[PDB]
Amino acid sequence: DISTLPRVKVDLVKPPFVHAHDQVAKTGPRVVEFTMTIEEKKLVIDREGTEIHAMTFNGSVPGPLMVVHENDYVELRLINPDTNTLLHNIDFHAATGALGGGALTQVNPGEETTLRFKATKPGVFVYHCAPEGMVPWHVTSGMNGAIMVLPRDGLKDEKGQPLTYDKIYYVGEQDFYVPKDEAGNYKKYETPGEAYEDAVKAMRTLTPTHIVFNGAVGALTGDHALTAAVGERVLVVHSQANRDTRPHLIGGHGDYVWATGKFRNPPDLDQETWLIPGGTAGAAFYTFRQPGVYAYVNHNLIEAFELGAAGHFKVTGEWNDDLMTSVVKPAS
Amino acid sequence: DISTLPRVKVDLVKPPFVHAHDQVAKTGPRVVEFTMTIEEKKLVIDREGTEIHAMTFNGSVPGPLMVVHENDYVELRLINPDTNTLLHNIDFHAATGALGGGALTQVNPGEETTLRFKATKPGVFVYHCAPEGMVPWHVTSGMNGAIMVLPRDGLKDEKGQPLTYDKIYYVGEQDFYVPKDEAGNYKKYETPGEAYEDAVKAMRTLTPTHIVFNGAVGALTGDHALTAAVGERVLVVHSQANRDTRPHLIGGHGDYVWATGKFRNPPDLDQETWLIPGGTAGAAFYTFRQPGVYAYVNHNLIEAFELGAAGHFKVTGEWNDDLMTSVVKPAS
Amino acid sequence: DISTLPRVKVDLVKPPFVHAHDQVAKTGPRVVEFTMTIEEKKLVIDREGTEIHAMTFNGSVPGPLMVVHENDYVELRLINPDTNTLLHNIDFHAATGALGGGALTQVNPGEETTLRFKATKPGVFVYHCAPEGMVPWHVTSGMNGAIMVLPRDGLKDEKGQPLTYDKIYYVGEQDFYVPKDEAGNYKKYETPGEAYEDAVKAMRTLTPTHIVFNGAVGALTGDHALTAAVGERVLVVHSQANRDTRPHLIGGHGDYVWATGKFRNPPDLDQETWLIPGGTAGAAFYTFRQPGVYAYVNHNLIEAFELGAAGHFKVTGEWNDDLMTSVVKPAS
Numbered sequence: 001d002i003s004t005l006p007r008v009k010v011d012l013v014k015p016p017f018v019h020a021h022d023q024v025a026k027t028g029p030r031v032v033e034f035t036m037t038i039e040e041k042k043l044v045i046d047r048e049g050t051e052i053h054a055m056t057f058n059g060s061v062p063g064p065l066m067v068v069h070e071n072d073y074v075e076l077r078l079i080n081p082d083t084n085t086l087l088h089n090i091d092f093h094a095a096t097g098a099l100g101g102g103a104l105t106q107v108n109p110g111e112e113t114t115l116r117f118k119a120t121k122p123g124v125f126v127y128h129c130a131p132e133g134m135v136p137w138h139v140t141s142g143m144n145g146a147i148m149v150l151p152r153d154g155l156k157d158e159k160g161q162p163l164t165y166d167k168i169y170y171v172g173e174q175d176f177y178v179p180k181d182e183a184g185n186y187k188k189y190e191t192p193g194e195a196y197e198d199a200v201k202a203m204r205t206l207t208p209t210h211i212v213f214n215g216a217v218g219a220l221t222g223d224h225a226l227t228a229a230v231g232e233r234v235l236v237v238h239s240q241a242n243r244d245t246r247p248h249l250i251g252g253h254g255d256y257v258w259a260t261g262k263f264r265n266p267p268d269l270d271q272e273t274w275l276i277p278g279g280t281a282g283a284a285f286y287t288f289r290q291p292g293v294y295a296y297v298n299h300n301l302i303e304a305f306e307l308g309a310a311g312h313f314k315v316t317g318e319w320n321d322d323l324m325t326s327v328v329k330p331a332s
Numbered sequence: 333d334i335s336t337l338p339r340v341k342v343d344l345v346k347p348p349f350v351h352a353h354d355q356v357a358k359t360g361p362r363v364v365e366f367t368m369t370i371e372e373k374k375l376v377i378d379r380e381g382t383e384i385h386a387m388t389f390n391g392s393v394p395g396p397l398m399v400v401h402e403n404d405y406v407e408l409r410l411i412n413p414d415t416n417t418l419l420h421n422i423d424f425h426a427a428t429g430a431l432g433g434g435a436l437t438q439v440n441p442g443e444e445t446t447l448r449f450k451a452t453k454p455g456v457f458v459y460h461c462a463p464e465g466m467v468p469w470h471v472t473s474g475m476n477g478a479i480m481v482l483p484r485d486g487l488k489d490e491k492g493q494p495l496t497y498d499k500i501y502y503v504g505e506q507d508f509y510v511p512k513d514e515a516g517n518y519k520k521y522e523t524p525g526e527a528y529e530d531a532v533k534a535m536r537t538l539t540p541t542h543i544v545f546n547g548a549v550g551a552l553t554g555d556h557a558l559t560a561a562v563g564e565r566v567l568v569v570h571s572q573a574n575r576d577t578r579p580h581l582i583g584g585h586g587d588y589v590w591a592t593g594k595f596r597n598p599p600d601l602d603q604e605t606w607l608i609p610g611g612t613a614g615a616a617f618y619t620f621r622q623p624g625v626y627a628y629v630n631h632n633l634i635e636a637f638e639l640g641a642a643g644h645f646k647v648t649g650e651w652n653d654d655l656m657t658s659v660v661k662p663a664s
Numbered sequence: 665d666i667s668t669l670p671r672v673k674v675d676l677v678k679p680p681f682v683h684a685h686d687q688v689a690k691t692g693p694r695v696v697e698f699t700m701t702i703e704e705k706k707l708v709i710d711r712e713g714t715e716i717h718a719m720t721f722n723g724s725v726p727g728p729l730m731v732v733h734e735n736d737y738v739e740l741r742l743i744n745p746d747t748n749t750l751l752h753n754i755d756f757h758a759a760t761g762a763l764g765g766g767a768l769t770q771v772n773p774g775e776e777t778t779l780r781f782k783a784t785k786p787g788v789f790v791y792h793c794a795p796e797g798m799v800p801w802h803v804t805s806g807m808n809g810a811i812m813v814l815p816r817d818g819l820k821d822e823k824g825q826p827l828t829y830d831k832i833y834y835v836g837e838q839d840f841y842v843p844k845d846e847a848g849n850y851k852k853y854e855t856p857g858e859a860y861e862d863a864v865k866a867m868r869t870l871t872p873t874h875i876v877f878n879g880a881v882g883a884l885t886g887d888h889a890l891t892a893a894v895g896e897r898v899l900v901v902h903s904q905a906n907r908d909t910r911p912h913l914i915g916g917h918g919d920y921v922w923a924t925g926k927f928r929n930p931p932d933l934d935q936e937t938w939l940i941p942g943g944t945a946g947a948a949f950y951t952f953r954q955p956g957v958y959a960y961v962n963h964n965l966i967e968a969f970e971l972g973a974a975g976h977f978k979v980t981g982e983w984n985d986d987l988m989t990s991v992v993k994p995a996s
């Protein structure tokens with residue numbers, strides 16, 4: 001009887017940050033209430049000023065990370081305001097039935113809907129838009145995110161002992177297929193609808209024009225670099241709704257990795273690079289041991305350094321010469 | 333001494349169906365006899381009427397699934413009738429030695445051969461044609477299938493308890509590279525031999541023109557949708573002989589997945605999406621919990637919804653509102 | 665106190681061979697000293713005589729495999745002689761901090777540097793060049809290799825029992841992106857610097873022109889085929905610094921596979937084909953059971969047989985008819 005369960009309302013935050021939550025559940029099962037508003041907006045995705053018509057959940061690419069516990073109910077109010085132009089919906093890979101909820105959430109502009117589902121399996125999972133006949137166009141326009149379903153007793157290592165993270169970040173990786181004219185210049189449209197047949201032809205090449213973290217080339221750099229301190233335990237959730245990716249922390253490792261994101265499985269240890277298949281979310285746990293700048297990339301290095309799939313951590317603290325040292329600095 | 337072993341003759345059925353077999357072996361080791369006839373035929377692969385010259389085992393793409401138990405002998409009579417034009421052979425990834433049998437099975441039109449091999453390792457494995465100098469052309473013309481080698485005591489979960497399936501389907505996923513003229517229209521040839529140098533150039537782009545389940549866009553839909561009932565336990569075997577794939581059941585999960593198909597390993601649990609590397613067969617076990625239409629796709633959504641890698645399940649039974657429900661239907 | 669530790673100097677050998685080492689450590693922790701010299705050279709990569717300007721560690725593509733034990737220190741003297749034209753450095757995925765050492769090893773021509781790092785995690789790992797702003801160009805010009813960090817008590821199976829290899833080979837797989845003119849012919853340049861903007865445009869297609877083992881089409885064939893004997897236990901280390909690969913031994917299996925290369929994890933058993941994500945090294949252990957020629961390929965068969973990712977083993981010994989036999993040889 002759901003009506004006897006506590007209801008909690010959560011306000012979502014913008015990626016790469018994650019809304020406040022408890023790792024080990026401090027209550028019994030709850031109905032966890034989220035609201036998301038769909039926003040179609042123009043987005044500048046690179047340093048050259050290339051613009052697309054992005055389709056978003058809550059104004060960001062990716063959509064925000066939702067965090068619940070195993071056997072909570074998720075109740076999502078989904079709003080499509082009348083300033084949008086397209087029909088949208090939502091499919092949760094965490095959920096069971098009705099095309100992940102996609103069959104029950106089709107909202108024209110000016111409509112809203114409320115879906116509830118039980119979070120029966122622990123893990124990180126992708127959610128994304130999936131309207132009949134226009135699935136890849138919506139997804140590769142940025143209409144995807146993830147949800148983390150924590151076990152009620154939090155995360156465990158390969159021997160079943162607790163793993164507690166100090167910080168958590170969400171990296172959404174987006175493949176874009178910007179249409180190009182004959183000479184290779186990117187095209188521009190006034191509405192999303194205008195772009196449709198060009199977008200399909202661009203997708204059909206299977207060759208993205210941009211691959212980015214958090215919606216743009218250089219989004220996780222400079223003043224927007226991820227931060228940590230030496231000795232901190234950091235969980236990085238990474239999703240790709242459409243295309244394989246192979247994350248790698250330059251200068252570090254994935255101490256404990258759930259590459260396909262499902263926490264009833266033991267983690268893989270000591271990973272250099274791991275594969276997150278398209279349509280999956282994964283999670284990697286690392287404890288920082290050295291200060292400095294680290295780069296977090298897709299380790300297809302062309303995708304990283306030419307197409308944009310690279311961000312930075314800035315880590316503060318004490319240098320440990322036992323782990324690495326320059327014996328003779330570069331010299332003639 | 334093989335001559336003292338029982339011999340059983342099996343008649344194969346067309347994918348996605350699988351020939352009758354026992355999960356737990358009810359006899360000791362046997363010689364299991366199969367016959368396959370090679371058929372080169374014209375195949376229409378999409379709704380536009382694009383035709384290729386397909387090269388098949390037993391008239392289908394994929395070839396039929398063969399099922400034996402660990403430490404059975406497989407004896408295959410392979411027939412290349414004189415109505416075909418090409419030399420063919422067979423390589424079993426389940427087998428040991430002679431290029432998986434490819435070195436011993438080279439048959440010109442008008443020839444036949446009988447190979448025997450011992451099935452020493454449990455798992456699902458790919459088989460495919462592999463003639464010297466023309467390997468990828470034969471494979472990507474549809475000349476591949478799979479064989480399942482069950483452990484003698486059937487399948488086990490991660491804790492070694494029995495997993496029994498009620499139904500089993502075989503999904504063969506095929507990447508085609510149809511040659512194109514200057515403007516982008518698909519070419520047509522009278523014989524397979526005519527297409528050869530154009531086929532190579534098309535393969536070299538590494539970009540398929542079509543990716544399909546069971547030989548055509550829409551083959552596993554409509555009256556050809558896969559069926560199940562709520563409460564049924566379904567094993568889906570999925571092979572890709574040449575290119576990576578990332579299957580996903582929309583609205584469900586892979587409860588127990590052997591993504592690289594080898595049953596001495598524990599399954600991965602609770603998968604949303606899994607990676608089957610090209611040249612591999614994998615297997616996923618799911619118990620249906622909700623009725624309705626489900627889509628089974630490659631979760632590169634362009635490959636699924638534009639290039640054709642999508643099929644349907646139709647599941648009958650009772651709706652469970654506790655798992656999912658529409659709280660407020662779409663409305664203004 | 666490092667100054668009290670034994671120092672051992674190792675001379676590296678050319679791939680696919682590996683320098684002499686002990687599987688089970690016969691001493692305590694040591695400082696293991698390696699020297700590598702950077703060589704920029706012209707390389708002929710295919711049977712047509714296509715030439716590139718390769719950037720190498722120690723004159724080979726890949727760079728040599730380095731072998732140490734867990735909790736050894738690696739001290740690398742890296743030399744960039746004044747006959748080279750570019751700035752280079754080295755990033756070890758085995759190491760912790762400073763961008764894997766890349767931040768501390770930037771050497772102009774005429775310079776050298778000595779880096780030391782502690783090998784804290786057991787596994788095979790990629791190393792590669794990674795100069796600021798030119799990372800993928802250096803890597804896809806062949807400037808990568810691997811390092812194996814053995815556990816102090818050698819390798820273990822899934823039940824923790826010793827696995828001892830009789831032989832070890834290193835296969836480095838290289839994706840090249842040779843620029844092409846309008847008609848599709850490969851271009852030629854006098855210096856590496858000349859090629860730069862054409863190289864970027866070629867990389868951006870995400871479509872390699874060649875994928876090769878040990879630096880050239882056909883490098884691991886003929887008199888350069890890998891050898892073994894029936895009954896021998898062979899470890900094959902396989903690295904790909906930039907792009908996914910799916911190795912497969914035609915006629916055999918991966919008995920024990922660490923597909924992502926990290927030895928604290930149990931191996932996957934009985935693999936037909938496995939996925940090594942780009943930016944990773946993996947390792948596969950096989951015991952040969954049949955004599956003959958075997959092909960070791962990337963099982964995207966186009967990448968193998970058209971683009972060049974294929975080599976051979978030649979195995980000597982006795983044929984076992986129980987495992988495979990031709991019952992009726994090909995005949996009318």
Ligand SMILES: O=N[O-]
Nearest residue numbers: 040041042053054
């Ligand atoms: O500004 N809407 O794409």
Ligand SMILES: O=N[O-]
Nearest residue numbers: 080081110111112
């Ligand atoms: O956007 N209508 O609630």
Ligand SMILES: O=N[O-]
Nearest residue numbers: 242243244278632
């Ligand atoms: O699905 N492409 O990695």
Ligand SMILES: O=N[O-]
Nearest residue numbers: 243244245300303
């Ligand atoms: O191929 N996926 O980056």
Ligand SMILES: O=N[O-]
Nearest residue numbers: 258259260261262
């Ligand atoms: O999907 N297990 O990480």
Ligand SMILES: O=N[O-]
Nearest residue numbers: 372373374385386
């Ligand atoms: O009809 N034979 O391709």
Ligand SMILES: O=N[O-]
Nearest residue numbers: 412413442443444
């Ligand atoms: O096709 N000859 O048996």
Ligand SMILES: O=N[O-]
Nearest residue numbers: 574575576610964
């Ligand atoms: O081998 N291509 O996924």
Ligand SMILES: O=N[O-]
Nearest residue numbers: 575576577632635
């Ligand atoms: O890249 N394989 O779909």
Ligand SMILES: O=N[O-]
Nearest residue numbers: 590591592593594
């Ligand atoms: O290959 N083991 O699923």
Ligand SMILES: O=N[O-]
Nearest residue numbers: 704705706717718
């Ligand atoms: O010959 N140096 O590229």
Ligand SMILES: O=N[O-]
Nearest residue numbers: 744745774775776
């Ligand atoms: O190349 N200078 O040591």
Ligand SMILES: O=N[O-]
Nearest residue numbers: 300906907908942
């Ligand atoms: O990163 N390409 O497999």
Ligand SMILES: O=N[O-]
Nearest residue numbers: 907908909964967
């Ligand atoms: O897609 N990697 O071969």
Ligand SMILES: O=N[O-]
Nearest residue numbers: 922923924925926
């Ligand atoms: O990464 N473990 O094979």
Ligand SMILES: [Cu+2]
Nearest residue numbers: 088129138143
């Ligand atoms: Cu949408």
